[PDB]
C-alpha cells in the first residue's frame, strides 16, 4: 500500500565485498548486453542509485542486474556507486551462488556451471556445490593482458613507476610505499584520495585501448600493493575507484590484471597460482589456466577462485512520498 | 537450505538516518526493558554486529529490536555499530512507521498512537496516517534537561566552551568553528576524529548523572553546531558517537538536548518550536510542549516531529559456512 516500486534484491558478500543482485522489476531492451546496458543507463540509472547509494546501500556497495541473453544463460549489468564497470570478479562469484542456491539454474554434479554474457566478454562461472550450498566459485575471467609500465608525473611526489593491465577493466597498479603509504586498515582515509588522483593523473598521460565493442578505453580503477599480513598470501592490495569506493575483497578483475603483468614480466608461468590479499585480510586464488591473443596483446586466461555467501534476501521498497527515494551519499 | 539463522528486518530512513528494525528471531527474557537489554548484551550481541556491521549494514547503521512489554505496546532495544544507546529519536519514528504500515498496530483516526518502553523512559509516538501511509511521526521524547556549560581542556586547542545536556542520552554540544572546522559535507573525515576526542576529553573532566535505573552516566554522543544552509532552519548540527558513526539526520535525542539548553538559557520559551538541520540538509522540528522535574533538574518535554520511510523489507540470512557471519568493519 505504501510502495511505488518494489525490487527483489538478493545480497552476497565475496571475501567481504558486497553484491546487491537484482532479480525483478527491470525490463531492458537490447540485442546484446552492451545495448541493454546503454538502455539501462538511459531509463534506469535511478535504480542504480536507489539500490547502492543510501539508505539502501552505502559508500562502497555494488550491484548486478540479471537480464536475458541469447548467447548465454544470462547477461549481467555490473554497477557501482559511481558508474558501470565492464566486468567484476566478486559480483560474478556472487551471481553464481544466488543463481544456484535459489534454484534458478539446475544444481548438478560436483560443479554446476553458468555461462554469462558480460560487457567485457563471455564469462564462465563454476560453482562447487555441497548439498544445496555453494562452497566456492571459480570464475574463468575474460582474457587479461599487460599494457605497459609508465613513468607518470604525480604532483607532490615526482615520477612514479606504474603498471597498467586489463583484467576485464583497465587498472593502475602501483606500490603503496612508492607513494608514501602502506595499505593497511589505518591508512584508508589517506589511501582513497591518493588512489583517486592516481586515476586522474594516469588517464591524462597514459592511453589504453581494448578492441572489443563496449569496453571503455580508460583506466577505471586503482590498485595499490604492499606486503601481505598472512603467510598464505603472495600479495596484498586495495582497489579503489569511482568517487572513493574501496574493494573489501582482493578484487577479481584487478588480481587478474596483476597476474597478467607478472606473466609478461615472466615472474609467473602458465599453470602457476597466485594468492591475493584484500585490505581486509581475505583472499582469492588465480591460476593461469591458459594463454590467447587479444587484439595483438598476449593474454593470460585467469581463473579466479573464492567464495560468496548470501547475506540478505530483500524486497527493496520505494515509499510513496520518500524525498530521498533516489539515494544520497556523503563520503 | 543454506541458512543457519534468519531474521525479519524492516529498514527505514528518518531524514536520511537508517533504522534496521528486527521483528523475528530474538527471544529475550527480563522483567523490563533494562533487564531484557542486559539479556541481549549477554547472549545476543552477535546479532547486533551481524545486522549493522558489514556486509549487512555499514559504518553508520542503526538497529532497534522489538520486544514485548507489560507497561507499553512494546519495548525497544536500541543498538548501533558500537553499543546500545538509552534512547534515539529517529529510530522511534522509524519503529512507529513500520508498526503501523505493516499493520502490527491498529491504524486509526488521523493519528494512531504507540506507547513504547525505552531504556530512558516511556515514549509516545504519534503517527499521522493518510490511507495506509504514515506521513509523519511526532515523538514525545522523555524529559530532557540542561546539566551545565564547562571549560574543558582540548589538546591542540586550549580551552573550549562546551554545553552538556540530556535528551535521552547525554550530549557534548560545542560550536564547530570553536574547534576549527565547519559542519558541512566536506569536513566529515575531519569532523569524525575531532568529535570523537571531544567525547573522550569531555568524559574525563565533566561528570553527569541521571537518576533513572539503566540510564548510563556518561556523555555518549558529540554534537557540533554551525550556521545552517537553508532558510527554514534555526540551527545545523552533526551528531557523532561510538567508533565514528555519524547521524545523517538532525538527531532527535540530541536536538531535544540542545533545546533544553536553549530553554534554560531562556533563548526558547515553552511552546516555541525549533527547526534543526542535519549535515545532509534534512530537518526535524521540536516543540517544548511542557516542563517537569527530573531528579531536581528542570526539564522540558520536547516533541520531535519528522518522517520516516520504509526502504527495505528483508530476510537477513546467516549462511552456513560464512567466515564473516558476525560482521566486520573498516572505518
Ligand atoms: O572483484 C572485482 O573484480 C570487483 C571489480 C570492481 C570492484 N571489485
Ligand atoms: O535521532 C537520534 O536521536 C539518534 C540518536 C543516536 C543517533 N541519532
Characterization of this structure:
Chains A, B: Belongs to the proline racemase family. Chains A, B: GO terms for molecular function: 4-hydroxyproline epimerase activity. Chains A, B: InterPro entries: Pro_racemase_fam. Chains A, B: It holds the Pfam family Pro_racemase. The structure is a homodimer of 331-residue chains. With 331 residues, chain A is α+β, with helices and mostly antiparallel strands. Chain A has 2 domains: 1-141 and 307-331, Diaminopimelate Epimerase, Chain A, domain 1, CATH 3.10.310.10; 142-306, Diaminopimelate Epimerase, Chain A, domain 1 (Roll), CATH 3.10.310.10. Chain A contains 5 helices and 17 strands. Chain A has helices spanning 33-43, 45-52, 89-101, 188-205, 252-264; strands spanning 3-14, 17-22, 62-67, 74-80, 111-118, 121-130, 133-140, 144-154, 158-166, 170-175, 219-226, 235-241, 245-246, 273-277, 283-294, 297-306, 308-319. Chain A has an 8-stranded mixed β-barrel. In chain A, helix 4 links the parallel strand 10 and strand 11. The two termini of chain A are 33 Å apart. Chains A and B meet through strand 1, strand 7 and strand 17 of A and strand 1, strand 7 and strand 17 of B. The complex binds proline (2 copies). The site of one proline (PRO) has 12 residues of chain B, from helix 3 and helix 5.
Amino acid at each position: 500500500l505504501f510502495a511505488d516500486h518494489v525490487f527483489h534484491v538478493v545480497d552476497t558478500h565475496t571475501e567481504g565485498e558486497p553484491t546487491r543482485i537484482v532479480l525483478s522489476g527491470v525490463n531492458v531492451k537490447g540485442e546484446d548486453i552492451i545495448e541493454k546496458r546503454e538502455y539501462f543507463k538511459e531509463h534506469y540509472d535511478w535504480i542504480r542509485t536507489a539500490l547502492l547509494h543510501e539508505p539502501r546501500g552505502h559508500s562502497d556497495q555494488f550491484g548486478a542486474v540479471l537480464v536475458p541473453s541469447d548467447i548465454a544463460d544470462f547477461g549481467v549489468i555490473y554497477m557501482d556507486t559511481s558508474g558501470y564497470l565492464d566486468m567484476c570478479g566478486h559480483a560474478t562469484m556472487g551471481v553464481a551462488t544466488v543463481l544456484v542456491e535459489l534454484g534458478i539454474i539446475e544444481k548438478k554434479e560436483p560443479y554446476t556451471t553458468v555461462k554469462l554474457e558480460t560487457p567485457a566478454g563471455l564469462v564462465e562461472a563454476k560453482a562447487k556445490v555441497k548439498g544445496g550450498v555453494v562452497k566456492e566459485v571459480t570464475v574463468v575471467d575474460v582474457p587479461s593482458f599487460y599494457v605497459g609500465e609508465f613513468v607518470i608525473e604525480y604532483p607532490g611526489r615526482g615520477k612514479i613507476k606504474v603498471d597498467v593491465a586489463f583484467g576485464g577493466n583497465f587498472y593502475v597498479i602501483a606500490d603503496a610505499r612508492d607513494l608514501g603509504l602502506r595499505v593497511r586498515r589505518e591508512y584508508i582515509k589517506e589511501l582513497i584520495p591518493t588512489a583517486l588522483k592516481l586515476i586522474k593523473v594516469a588517464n591524462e598521460q597514459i592511453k589504453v585501448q581494448h578492441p572489443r565493442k563496449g569496453v571503455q578505453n580508460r583506466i577505471n580503477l586503482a590498485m595499490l600493493t604492499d606486503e601481505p599480513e598472512r603467510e598464505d598470501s603472495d600479495g596484498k592490495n586495495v582497489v579503489i575507484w569511482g568517487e572513493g569506493s574501496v574493494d573489501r575483497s582482493p578484487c577479481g578483475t584487478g588480481s587478474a590484471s596483476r597476474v597478467a603483468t607478472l606473466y609478461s614480466k615472466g615472474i609467473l608461468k602458465e599453470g602457476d597460482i597466485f594468492v591475493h590479499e584484500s585490505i581486509l585480510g581475505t583472499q582469492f586464488r588465480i591460476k593461469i589456466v591458459g594463454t590467447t591473443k587479444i587484439g595483438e596483446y598476449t593474454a593470460i586466461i585467469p581463473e579466479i577462485t573464492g567464495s560468496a555467501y548470501i547475506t540478505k534476501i530483500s524486497q527493496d521498497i520505494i515509499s510513496k512520498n520518500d524525498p530521498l527515494w533516489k539515494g544520497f551519499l556523503l563520503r
